[PDB]
């Protein structure tokens, strides 16, 4: 369905939030889009190894 929302990256299934560098939604896009990658998880640690007890 077409909608009045605004975005900078569009893909068949639905628009994308283009702030992060990488995506895995759909390869064929239109816009100022993140790069498509065959990745399930790209998570970066900002804290430290959590060792409670």
């Amino acid at each position: 369905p077409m909608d009045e929302c605004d975005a900078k990256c569009q893909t068949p299934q639905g628009a994308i939030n283009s702030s992060l560098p990488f995506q895995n939604v759909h390869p064929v896009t239109i816009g100022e889009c993140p790069k498509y990658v065959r990745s399930a998880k790209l998570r970066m640690v900002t804290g430290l190894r959590n060792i409670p007890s």
Binding site: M2, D3, C5, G14, A15, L42, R43, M44, N50
Partner: protein, 108 residues
């Protein structure tokens, strides 16, 4: 007696990150770099709205097929929207020459 110790923060976070040497390393803080959600909507790009063809292909829309919304109102667009198998194209059969090019150039 008196004591001074030095240590480091910890919390209940279960965020795991992969590392060169070790995998599933639970960490206190993390940040995602990988967008993996779409809003299931054809939003408009950089302020300009797409061109809706509804039931027609580009051929039908531009040839003036009798069943297509000609959308005289539309004076600009960012991209064009068809369906997988549009219903109303070249209503009188025949070959549309250099069709991919024209689709490309009318895209925006």
């Amino acid at each position: 007696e008196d004591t001074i110790c030095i240590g480091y923060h910890a919390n209940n976070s279960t965020d795991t990150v992969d590392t060169v040497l070790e995998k599933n390393v639970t960490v206190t803080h993390s940040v995602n770099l990988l967008e993996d959600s779409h809003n299931g909507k054809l939003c408009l790009l950089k302020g300009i709205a797409p061109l809706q063809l509804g039931n027609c292909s580009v051929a039908g829309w531009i040839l003036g097929n009798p069943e297509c919304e000609l959308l005289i109102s539309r004076e600009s667009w960012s991209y064009i929207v068809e369906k997988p198998n549009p219903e109303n194209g070249t209503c009188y059969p025949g070959h549309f020459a250099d069709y991919e090019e024209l689709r490309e150039q009318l895209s925006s």
